[PDB]
Scaffold this active site. Structure first.
Site, mmCIF file in Angstrom:
data_model
loop_
_atom_site.group_PDB
_atom_site.id
_atom_site.type_symbol
_atom_site.label_atom_id
_atom_site.label_comp_id
_atom_site.label_asym_id
_atom_site.label_seq_id
_atom_site.Cartn_x
_atom_site.Cartn_y
_atom_site.Cartn_z
ATOM 1 N N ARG A 1 0.835 -1.205 0.000
ATOM 2 C CA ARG A 1 0.000 0.000 0.000
ATOM 3 C C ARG A 1 0.875 1.262 0.000
ATOM 4 O O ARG A 1 0.409 2.359 -0.303
ATOM 5 C CB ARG A 1 -0.930 0.000 1.218
ATOM 6 N N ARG B 1 -8.778 5.990 17.665
ATOM 7 C CA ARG B 1 -9.181 5.974 16.249
ATOM 8 C C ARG B 1 -10.570 6.630 16.192
ATOM 9 O O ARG B 1 -11.557 6.061 16.674
ATOM 10 C CB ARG B 1 -9.175 4.518 15.707
ATOM 11 N N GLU C 1 -12.182 5.665 8.119
ATOM 12 C CA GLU C 1 -11.042 4.892 7.652
ATOM 13 C C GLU C 1 -11.359 4.236 6.328
ATOM 14 O O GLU C 1 -12.461 3.751 6.125
ATOM 15 C CB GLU C 1 -10.669 3.809 8.672
ATOM 16 N N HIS D 1 -11.020 1.148 3.796
ATOM 17 C CA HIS D 1 -10.865 -0.312 3.990
ATOM 18 C C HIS D 1 -10.843 -0.970 2.599
ATOM 19 O O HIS D 1 -11.622 -0.588 1.716
ATOM 20 C CB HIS D 1 -12.083 -0.827 4.814
ATOM 21 N N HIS D 2 -9.940 -1.932 2.407
ATOM 22 C CA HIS D 2 -9.913 -2.713 1.171
ATOM 23 C C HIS D 2 -10.812 -3.933 1.336
ATOM 24 O O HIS D 2 -10.611 -4.769 2.226
ATOM 25 C CB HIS D 2 -8.473 -3.130 0.813
ATOM 26 N N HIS E 1 -14.654 -0.951 11.333
ATOM 27 C CA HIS E 1 -13.415 -1.500 10.720
ATOM 28 C C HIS E 1 -12.688 -2.457 11.686
ATOM 29 O O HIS E 1 -12.123 -3.456 11.250
ATOM 30 C CB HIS E 1 -12.453 -0.361 10.284
ATOM 31 N N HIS F 1 -11.917 -6.574 11.022
ATOM 32 C CA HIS F 1 -10.637 -7.246 11.231
ATOM 33 C C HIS F 1 -10.462 -7.851 12.644
ATOM 34 O O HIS F 1 -9.338 -8.110 13.080
ATOM 35 C CB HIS F 1 -9.511 -6.259 10.910
HETATM 36 ZN ZN LIG Z 1 -9.791 -3.164 6.211
#
Ligand SMILES: [Zn+2]
Length: 134
Positions: free
Chosen positions: A5, A96, A100, A102-103, A127, A131
């Site tokens: 990335r 946080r 955000e 996110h892929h 997010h 994960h």
């Molecule tokens: Zn993500």
């Protein structure tokens, strides 16, 4: 070695049509899509890193009346400078506090870094749930 990335690339993808309440989807299932009007601004542009791309996304949000309508004054000022805006407090987690990117298909599975059909806008809460604590 650091994640890919961090490597330069060109933005691709169509994005999706959204409404003026689009960020209300960020805390839901797979977050909100990149808006089609933002994709139309950034497609074919070269970026130095994914963070460079993120800055360009929020700058283009700041210039779109409809996409920035429901941002408060402080958040409108943040996005004009390329900063991610704060989410509602109930969707923040610890340090946080901002939306955000996110892929959807992870880069670890061959998902593309700058493909705007593979990027979702999420809240920290959503997010970290996606994960499983990271
Ligand atoms: Zn993500």
């Amino acid at each position: 070695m650091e994640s890919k990335r961090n490597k330069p690339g060109k933005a691709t993808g169509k994005g999706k049509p959204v409404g003026d309440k689009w960020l209300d989807d960020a805390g839901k299932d797979s977050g909100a899509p990149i808006p089609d009007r933002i994709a139309d601004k950034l497609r074919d542009k070269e970026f130095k890193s994914f963070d460079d791309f993120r800055k360009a996304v929020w700058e283009e949000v700041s210039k779109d009346p409809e996409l920035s309508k429901n941002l408060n004054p402080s958040n409108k000022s943040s996005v004009s400078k390329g900063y991610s805006p704060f989410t509602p407090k109930n969707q923040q987690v610890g340090g946080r506090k901002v939306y955000e990117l996110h892929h959807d298909k992870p880069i670890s599975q061959g998902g593309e870094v700058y493909d705007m059909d593979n990027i979702r806008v999420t809240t920290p809460k959503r997010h970290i749930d996606i994960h499983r604590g990271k």
